[PDB]
Design a protein around this ligand. Structure first.
Ligand code: SFP
Ligand code: CA
Ligand code: MN
Length: 237
């Protein structure tokens, strides 16, 4: 039922459902089997940054993930969102752990969406920016194990009192207000999202990953979407 478009920062290779045999970033359109991926040199314990951009002229969804003094990974894919998503959506962040685990900490998150229409200066826009999360962040819909407040961060998956990440966890945070992502009379529709994150794992193999996603407004975590399904899809098709 849920329509999902996501950019995944996939830390664990599940080669049987299509993942490359290394940590990677990917663009997922309605399926966990990324339409395109790029090798990603994940760094256990360092704060990374992801930038996701899209505009309706090029109809190109792109993403870059980087770490200070290190190389960035980028991946792009041609997609006409007007054909995939409803015109009103919610945007959010999702992460999970399964048999293997890692912390999926979000330090900041900002988003900007703009619809420049056939009337010019008749632009509708939405922008939000979180550099700190409060214990009671009322403008975020928290699903599953996601929580805020710990040192002003958003922990998408369960982390015990001493900081150890737990397995079999899934959590998502969606911005409260629906977002008008496209409208047919719009000359140019575009958006940009940025978030900083901290993935740490005591394990040799961290899992499962973090994703930025856009979905139908009433999207909820699909049953059994812990692990490789990243809290976004009901199965691996
Ligand atoms: C642990 C595992 N081991 C998990 C495993 C890990 C993580 C999760 S989860 O849900 O926690 O991420 C669930 C299961 C899997 N193991 C396979 C698997 C396998 C299954 C199906 C297919 S085939 O159908 O032929 O392609 C090929 C290979 C083979 C073979 N092993 C699939 C999942
Ligand atoms: Ca994976
Ligand atoms: Mn993947």
């Amino acid at each position: 039922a849920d329509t999902i478009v996501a950019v995944e920062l996939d830390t664990y290779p599940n080669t049987d459902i299509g993942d490359p045999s290394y940590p990677h970033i990917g663009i997922d359109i309605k399926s966990v089997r990324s339409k395109k991926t790029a090798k990603w040199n994940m760094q256990n314990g360092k704060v990374g940054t992801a930038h996701i951009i899209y505009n309706s002229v090029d109809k190109r969804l792109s993403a870059v993930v980087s770490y200070p003094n290190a190389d960035s990974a980028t991946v792009s894919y041609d997609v006409d969102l007007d054909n995939v998503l409803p015109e009103w959506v919610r945007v959010g962040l999702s992460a999970s752990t399964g048999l293997y685990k890692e912390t999926n900490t979000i330090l900041s998150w900002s988003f900007t969406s703009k619809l420049k229409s056939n009337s010019t200066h008749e632009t509708n826009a939405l922008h939000f920016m979180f550099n700190q999360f409060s214990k009671d962040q009322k403008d975020l819909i928290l699903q599953g194990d996601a929580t805020t407040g710990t040192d002003g961060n958003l922990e998408l998956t369960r982390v015990s009192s001493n900081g150890s990440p737990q397995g079999s966890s899934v959590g998502r945070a969606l911005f409260y207000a629906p977002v008008h992502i496209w409208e047919s009379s719009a000359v140019v529709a575009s958006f940009e999202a940025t978030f900083t994150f901290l993935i740490k794992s005591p394990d040799s193999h961290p899992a499962d990953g973090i994703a930025f996603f856009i979905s139908n407004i009433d999207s909820s975590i699909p049953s059994g979407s812990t692990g490789r399904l990243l809290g976004l899809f009901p199965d691996a098709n």
